[PDB]
From a paper:
Here, we present structural information for the human antibody PN-SIA28’s heterosubtypic binding of hemagglutinin (HA) from circulating and emerging potential influenza A viruses (IAVs). The globular HA head domain recognizes host proteins bearing sialic acid on their surface, while the HA stem triggers the fusion of viral and host membranes following endocytosis, allowing release of viral contents into the cell. Anti-stem antibodies exhibit much broader cross-subtype neutralizing activity in vitro and in vivo by inhibiting the low pH-induced HA conformational rearrangement, hence blocking membrane fusion. In our structures, we found that each Fab variable fragment interacts with just one protomer of the HA trimer, and PN-SIA28 recognized conserved residues in the stem region of HA by binding in a very similar orientation to the HAs.
Author numbering:
A (entry chain A): 1 to 226
B (entry chain B): 1 to 214
Write the structure that this text describes.
Amino acid sequence: QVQLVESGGGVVQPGRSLRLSCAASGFPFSSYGMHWVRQAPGKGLEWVAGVSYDGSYKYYADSVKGRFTISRDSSKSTLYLQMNSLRPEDTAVYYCARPSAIFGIYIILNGLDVWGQGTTVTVSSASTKGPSVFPLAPSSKSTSGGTAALGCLVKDYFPEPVTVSWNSGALTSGVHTFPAVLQSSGLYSLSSVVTVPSSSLGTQTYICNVNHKPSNTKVDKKVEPK
Amino acid sequence: EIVLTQSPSSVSASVGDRVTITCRATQGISSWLAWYQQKPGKPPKLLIFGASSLQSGVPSRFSGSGSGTDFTLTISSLQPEDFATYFCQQAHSFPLTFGGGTKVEIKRTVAAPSVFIFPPSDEQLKSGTASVVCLLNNFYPREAKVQWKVDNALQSGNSQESVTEQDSKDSTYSLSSTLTLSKADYEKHKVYACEVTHQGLSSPVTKSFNRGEC
């Protein structure tokens, strides 16, 4: 009922601009102050900007002063965050948040009642690139055995994310798809692994399905022992 | 600028346990401290404001206390849906400030990792770069040390690590380590090894292959 809908995120090269939007519904919008909060991947929460209910007073973190501009539109019940001179340090998921009232009293400084779903901002000089997919072949140092491990190296793609399934979804037990790491080149790389019984090798085929929609890339890599 | 310091950074507990998280401020914030809950992929969720006032709908097992500089969040009996990250927030003054966060994890018995090493594929070798991957599978607790060695030479600055969350069925972790070399460097040496130090191991486990077909 009461919710904040966000939009405007995306991938942008360093030094460019972006404008975030937060549309409110279900509550009196222009009675509340409003805040923008961001959270870098793996990091914690950081407040970036706030504005009073009437738009007369605006507050900024030191990290964004002179660069970010907060504003609001009462007719549209919409909150804005104009972000200029973006740098990779600004890569995060951005939220709009509403300070909680205390028994009818609207205070801009309180715990944050309601949060938007978030919109992701990526600041990178990298260009869209499909992943290279390499097999992590299962091994042996005898002929028979117990449980074997095989996997899929999804390397050098941009931007996030890639989806990985095994045998078109028929293989889910023992699967670990690891979070991507950001390499020095600016491209991402992750690996998906699965543990199988050693009797399966040779009899059962293992196919790793990698989809990267930003580049319309779809790869089916069969992983067999060398 | 007021800075908040949460303690501890993480805690492992079982369902039914009593968990106590503290938040310390560099200045006095009277009673303008809020507590949040966050699960991966979702926005934060307010639990406490005014340092003791429960949000509407939040279970009564969540209690907040304290004033001035020292504060405390308490969960009187942990429930399965309470394993998440918890943040304190200061609302005494601008700028608004969050604590580093406290992650409450599922406690279980020690589990030693299964270690696997994977040589680079021949398809990648044609591109001019080689990636050796090492897998640590289903271990607990999370603390582990992976050291790469090539011809017994300890590597530095050419590897990256990635860890999953606790598995939904056995509460263990898994870890992937990727050593990245140039093909010329890779063909220049023979034995590639992955050394794993974990408290479930009496001695470090090393897995190794040697380049060729061995």
